[PDB]
């Protein structure tokens, strides 16, 4: 199976309140496992997945020390970018980075990420090939020229096939038992009266993990993908997720309609009838 | 482990 290690970085200025808020959030596959937040009472790297306790004091020190370095760097980045864009000193701005690697079971790098955003807009990213950059405007092009002078892509590539891979391997070695965790969706169908004459049945998927799921409504064999109303998957806040999907039907033959739930933690897709 | 970030 493939696996990924990704970091989600965020630095937000706030002039008139002191230091920019800096954060580093860590992800194995889609599960947050580490977190640094500059605003916490004691701004250190903290575990976010039980299985990270098994890392001794040196790990957390090393990572904390590095965040503080990264924090400093970004603190400056926000000013440079202010200049690049010839912006006032007043208001608050955001830099965001996604950084990390996707590697196969054979330990080869499938994909490497290093993407940047300023104020919610693409700024610059390392291309699929890991050697060239895509800048999204004239400010980003200044960064681009500096990085080519400095040999940044090559460096990243070194980290992405080396460092990134080896830490993921360990991170998997540590909490592999836990990351398999699936919680099967418990499903029910609810009936709702409407005006006019028609009715809408709403198909629920409750208490499932991870969030990937699929809900489909079908009239006795053929699925309706144009009349279906759905909500975005949402957390219950207990660890599990929820989603529903509804459809408008004529009154009398609501039994003719079947709901289908597809989730990786289910031996068989659930097929529900009202 | 997160990379040491380059300056933009």
């Amino acid at each position, epitope marked *: 199976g493939p696996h990924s290690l990704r970091y989600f970085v965020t630095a937000v200025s706030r002039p008139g309140l002191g230091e920019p808020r800096y954060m580093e959030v860590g992800y194995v596959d889609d599960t947050e496992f580490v977190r640094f937040d500059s605003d916490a009472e004691n701004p250190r790297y903290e575990p976010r997945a039980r299985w990270m306790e098994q890392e001794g004091p040196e790990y957390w020190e090393r990572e904390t020390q590095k965040a503080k*370095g990264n924090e400093q760097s970004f603190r*400056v980045d926000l000013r*440079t970018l202010l200049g690049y864009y010839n912006q006032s000193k007043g208001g608050s701005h955001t830099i965001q980075v996604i950084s990390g690697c996707e590697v196969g079971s054979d330990g080869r790098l499938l994909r490497g990420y290093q993407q940047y955003a300023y104020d919610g807009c693409d700024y610059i990213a390392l291309n699929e090939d890991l050697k060239t950059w895509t800048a999204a405007d004239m400010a980003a092009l200044i960064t681009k020229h500096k990085w080519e*002078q400095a040999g940044e892509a090559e460096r990243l590539r070194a980290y992405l096939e*080396g460092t990134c891979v080896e830490w993921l391997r360990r991170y998997l070695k540590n909490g592999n038992a836990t990351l398999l965790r699936t919680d099967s969706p418990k499903a029910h169908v609810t009936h709702h009266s409407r005006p006019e004459d028609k009715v809408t049945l709403r198909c629920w998927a409750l208490g499932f993990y991870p969030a990937d799921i699929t809900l489909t409504w079908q009239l006795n064999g053929e699925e309706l993908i144009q009349d279906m109303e759905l909500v975005e998957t949402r957390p219950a806040g207990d660890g599990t997720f929820q989603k529903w999907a509804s459809v408008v039907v004529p009154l009398g033959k609501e039994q003719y309609y079947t709901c289908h739930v597809y989730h990786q933690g289910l031996p068989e897709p659930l097929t529900l009838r009202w | 482990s997160i990379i040491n970030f380059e300056k933009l």
Partner: antibody
Framework: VLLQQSGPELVKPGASVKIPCKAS????????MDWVKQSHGKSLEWIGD????????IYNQKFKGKATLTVDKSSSAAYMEVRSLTSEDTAVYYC??????????????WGQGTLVTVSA | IQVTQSSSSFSVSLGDRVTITCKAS??????LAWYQQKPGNAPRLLIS???SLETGVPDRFSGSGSRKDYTLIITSLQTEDVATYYC?????????FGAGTKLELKR
């Protein structure tokens, strides 16, 4: 390319000193200014750098609070202030320049270095 | 990331082949530089990126190594090579130097 520093400084325990570094022979604003400390005991140690366009600073966690970096963009000049001096601060302080702009490089040019002696 | 030079001083003869080791505490991926320094002067850049000879530096200076083990080579020690030598990594920040290897003439 040339980075000119001041001559020897004799200073007293508890006091502080400010070392200048005047740069010439290149576009000041396209580079940063790094500072390095050399002393019996720890040899060469990094310290920090300054951005000449906005005075943005990065410090070695080891020197945070012990050193302050400033820039005069217009006279192409960088200054370091080492505060609350101990005998452990007695050393030669270099300013230096990477061959390009970035966090990860080597130092292609050095100032002549300024010896600082802490004594009462 | 600690950079370690084992030998702090080294006795040498003119014409010798001299090898100065530099040991990194983590893989530094060839991001290593070498400086030469003579008394009362600032360090002078000899080599960057592990094997790359800086302009002006004489041809008798050479670099090699991988991962976390690097060497500075001087194939035939001339008299003005009597100096102290420093290696400096830049794979991670803060940039960190070794403690130097000081050469001295045998007699």
């Amino acid at each position: 390319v040339l980075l000119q520093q001041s001559g020897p400084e004799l200073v007293k325990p508890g006091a502080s000193v400010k070392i200048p570094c005047k740069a010439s022979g290149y576009t000041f604003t396209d580079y940063n200014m790094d500072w390095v400390k050399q002393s019996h005991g720890k040899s060469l140690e990094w310290i920090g750098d300054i951005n000449p366009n906005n005075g943005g600073t990065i410090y070695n966690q080891k020197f945070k609070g012990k050193a302050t970096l400033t820039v005069d963009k217009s006279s192409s000049a960088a200054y370091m202030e080492v505060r609350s001096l101990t005998s452990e601060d007695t050393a030669v302080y270099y300013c230096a320049r990477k061959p390009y702009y970035g966090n990860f490089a080597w130092f292609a040019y050095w100032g002549q270095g300024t010896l600082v002696t802490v004594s009462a | 990331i600690q950079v370690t030079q084992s030998s702090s001083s080294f006795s040498v003869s003119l014409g010798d082949r001299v090898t100065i080791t530099c040991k990194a505490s983590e893989d530094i991926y060839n991001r290593l530089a070498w400086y030469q320094q003579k008394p009362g002067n600032a360090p002078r850049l000899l080599i960057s990126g592990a094997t790359s000879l800086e302009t002006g530096v004489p041809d008798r200076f050479s670099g090699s190594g991988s991962r976390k083990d690097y060497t500075l080579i001087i194939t035939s020690l001339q008299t003005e090579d009597v100096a102290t030598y420093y290696c400096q990594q830049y794979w991670s920040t803060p940039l960190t130097f070794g403690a130097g290897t000081k050469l001295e003439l045998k007699r």
